[PDB]
Design a protein around this motif. Structure first.
Motif, PDB file in Angstrom:
ATOM      1  N   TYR A 142      41.382  27.421  67.289  1.00 57.29           N
ATOM      2  CA  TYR A 142      42.562  26.982  66.447  1.00 57.29           C
ATOM      3  C   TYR A 142      43.563  26.234  67.518  1.00 57.29           C
ATOM      4  O   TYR A 142      43.717  26.853  68.392  1.00 57.29           O
ATOM      5  CB  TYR A 142      43.236  28.405  65.846  1.00 57.29           C
ATOM      6  CG  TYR A 142      42.130  29.109  64.989  1.00 57.29           C
ATOM      7  CD1 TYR A 142      42.152  28.999  63.668  1.00 57.29           C
ATOM      8  CD2 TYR A 142      41.035  29.670  65.519  1.00 57.29           C
ATOM      9  CE1 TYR A 142      41.103  29.613  62.748  1.00 57.29           C
ATOM     10  CE2 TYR A 142      40.002  30.417  64.610  1.00 57.29           C
ATOM     11  CZ  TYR A 142      40.221  30.113  63.432  1.00 57.29           C
ATOM     12  OH  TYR A 142      39.281  30.969  62.429  1.00 57.29           O
TER      13      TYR A 142
ATOM     14  N   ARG B  74      41.102  31.013  70.886  1.00 59.82           N
ATOM     15  CA  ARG B  74      39.610  31.178  70.477  1.00 59.82           C
ATOM     16  C   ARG B  74      39.901  32.395  69.434  1.00 59.82           C
ATOM     17  O   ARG B  74      38.710  32.619  68.782  1.00 59.82           O
ATOM     18  CB  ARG B  74      38.880  31.330  71.536  1.00 59.82           C
ATOM     19  CG  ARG B  74      39.115  32.276  72.714  1.00 59.82           C
ATOM     20  CD  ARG B  74      38.026  32.698  73.472  1.00 59.82           C
ATOM     21  NE  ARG B  74      37.432  31.676  74.456  1.00 59.82           N
ATOM     22  CZ  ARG B  74      37.439  31.754  75.755  1.00 59.82           C
ATOM     23  NH1 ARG B  74      38.091  32.592  76.386  1.00 59.82           N
ATOM     24  NH2 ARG B  74      36.940  30.769  76.549  1.00 59.82           N
ATOM     25  N   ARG B  75      40.978  32.868  69.017  1.00 53.24           N
ATOM     26  CA  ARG B  75      41.186  34.017  67.891  1.00 53.24           C
ATOM     27  C   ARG B  75      42.298  33.284  67.244  1.00 53.24           C
ATOM     28  O   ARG B  75      43.316  33.130  67.668  1.00 53.24           O
ATOM     29  CB  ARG B  75      41.318  35.276  68.324  1.00 53.24           C
ATOM     30  CG  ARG B  75      40.165  35.795  69.237  1.00 53.24           C
ATOM     31  CD  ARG B  75      38.992  36.116  68.299  1.00 53.24           C
ATOM     32  NE  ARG B  75      37.761  36.742  68.999  1.00 53.24           N
ATOM     33  CZ  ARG B  75      36.921  35.785  69.657  1.00 53.24           C
ATOM     34  NH1 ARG B  75      36.907  34.558  69.586  1.00 53.24           N
ATOM     35  NH2 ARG B  75      35.722  36.410  70.308  1.00 53.24           N
ATOM     36  N   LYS B  76      42.148  33.391  65.863  1.00 51.23           N
ATOM     37  CA  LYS B  76      43.337  32.778  64.980  1.00 51.23           C
ATOM     38  C   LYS B  76      44.410  33.880  64.904  1.00 51.23           C
ATOM     39  O   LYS B  76      44.077  35.238  64.923  1.00 51.23           O
ATOM     40  CB  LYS B  76      42.854  32.770  63.497  1.00 51.23           C
ATOM     41  CG  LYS B  76      43.938  32.316  62.663  1.00 51.23           C
ATOM     42  CD  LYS B  76      43.644  32.136  61.138  1.00 51.23           C
ATOM     43  CE  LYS B  76      44.738  31.555  60.210  1.00 51.23           C
ATOM     44  NZ  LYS B  76      44.044  31.322  59.081  1.00 51.23           N
TER      45      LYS B  76
ATOM     46  N   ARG C  94      42.077  24.680  62.287  1.00 50.13           N
ATOM     47  CA  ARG C  94      40.800  24.983  62.498  1.00 50.13           C
ATOM     48  C   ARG C  94      39.833  23.982  62.645  1.00 50.13           C
ATOM     49  O   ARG C  94      39.910  23.160  61.638  1.00 50.13           O
ATOM     50  CB  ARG C  94      40.257  26.190  61.617  1.00 50.13           C
ATOM     51  CG  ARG C  94      39.050  26.680  61.996  1.00 50.13           C
ATOM     52  CD  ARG C  94      38.484  27.820  61.145  1.00 50.13           C
ATOM     53  NE  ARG C  94      37.487  28.370  61.391  1.00 50.13           N
ATOM     54  CZ  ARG C  94      36.227  28.265  61.111  1.00 50.13           C
ATOM     55  NH1 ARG C  94      35.822  27.155  60.128  1.00 50.13           N
ATOM     56  NH2 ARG C  94      35.158  28.920  61.531  1.00 50.13           N
TER      57      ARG C  94
ATOM     58  N   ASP D 278      35.287  26.414  66.521  1.00 49.30           N
ATOM     59  CA  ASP D 278      35.334  27.806  66.548  1.00 49.30           C
ATOM     60  C   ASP D 278      36.890  28.072  67.249  1.00 49.30           C
ATOM     61  O   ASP D 278      36.781  29.159  67.657  1.00 49.30           O
ATOM     62  CB  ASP D 278      34.175  28.358  67.378  1.00 49.30           C
ATOM     63  CG  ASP D 278      32.948  28.724  66.442  1.00 49.30           C
ATOM     64  OD1 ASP D 278      33.079  28.561  65.181  1.00 49.30           O
ATOM     65  OD2 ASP D 278      31.954  29.336  66.965  1.00 49.30           O
TER      66      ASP D 278
ATOM     67  N   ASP E 248      47.275  36.346  63.850  1.00 49.63           N
ATOM     68  CA  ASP E 248      47.883  36.760  62.837  1.00 49.63           C
ATOM     69  C   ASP E 248      49.503  36.679  62.447  1.00 49.63           C
ATOM     70  O   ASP E 248      50.314  37.388  63.204  1.00 49.63           O
ATOM     71  CB  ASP E 248      47.479  38.398  62.542  1.00 49.63           C
ATOM     72  CG  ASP E 248      47.891  38.618  60.802  1.00 49.63           C
ATOM     73  OD1 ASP E 248      48.733  38.395  60.344  1.00 49.63           O
ATOM     74  OD2 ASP E 248      47.063  39.654  60.512  1.00 49.63           O
TER      75      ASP E 248
END
Lengths: 178, 173
Positions: free
Chosen positions: A137, A99-101, A132, A135, A103
């Motif tokens: 990834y 739920r968070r891309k 993506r 919402d 890094d």
């Protein structure tokens, strides 16, 4: 669609402190909890892929599991999971759902100082493209992005993470942080 | 519509884990985990301690157990659990336990007198259809209602079913 909502799914998540990492698997059918799997891996170690495949090979559901869901390509911090290898050895496709891309440059900046950086780099590369859609990834092994998307949707009950992942996260967190 | 806390255990030759699961309408909302001594005496404290800890503690309708026997013969004092937590306890069992044989198979352990008292305080066993229950802090009838409300498939409280699966995976799977 309606049909895929009934397929047997395995969701895996972890938790770790300063000393132990546990990895929990949960098998659900239409959201109904049917079984669990458990193992421990080395924090920032190199054993996650072997440990995960070995865990699945112990499931009494392996011939009925239609998809494996993961919360990222690493467990125990920096213990990478080779998702192509999991797919090959278990014969079950893998969807990574985040739920968070991530890094990935930041991640590599850490990874470059760990034992066997070369293998680790290769495992990250074989995970392939980060897609993506909506919402969240995703990365996948054994599926197109479209097929992966359908499977994620079919695995949701309430909220945006596959149901057995949500449940395995609750178990693993309780074991470690409680 | 209540939140129910279902507890089960698993143990082997070395370790015993106790798993708690919180469900609402069968929907899994949370888990609790502790370890206790096999054939020990710490289960009541560990269970009360575990419940306290927890973030659903003031939302729990009742605690379900599959027997008082955790970690083999590490017995749970259900009256004490109820008094210390303020949460009532319902013990649900598929088999009518032979408590004559239970009192015998335990005489070998340290402080049998203490253990005997724990067995005694769990109190009357009621045939509730199909299962058998003991209660602390509820009548047979109120407990019966809660057991029925907690079922999805099969005749055991849903969060007990789910905690068994977790505990057994950790120890044996």
């Amino acid at each position: 669609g309606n049909a895929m909502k009934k397929w047997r799914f395995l969701g895996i998540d972890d938790s770790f402190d300063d000393r132990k990492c546990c990895v929990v698997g949960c098998v659900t059918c239409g959201g109904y909890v049917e079984g669990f799997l458990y193992t421990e891996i080395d924090i920032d170690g190199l054993d996650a892929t072997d440990k995960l495949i070995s865990m699945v090979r112990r499931s009494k559901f392996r011939e009925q599991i239609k998809c494996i869901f993961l919360p990222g390509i690493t467990l125990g911090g920096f213990n990478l999971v080779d998702i192509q290898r999991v797919y090959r050895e278990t014969k079950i496709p893998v969807v990574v759902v985040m739920r968070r891309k991530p890094d990935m440059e930041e991640f590599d900046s850490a990874m470059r100082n760990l034992e066997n950086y070369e293998l680790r780099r290769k495992i990250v590369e074989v995970a392939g493209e980060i897609h993506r859609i909506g919402d969240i990834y995703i990365q996948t092994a054994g599926l197109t992005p479209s097929e992966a998307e359908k499977l994620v949707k079919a695995s949701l009950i309430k909220g945006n993470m596959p149901e057995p992942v949500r449940i395995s996260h609750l178990v693993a967190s309780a074991i470690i942080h409680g």
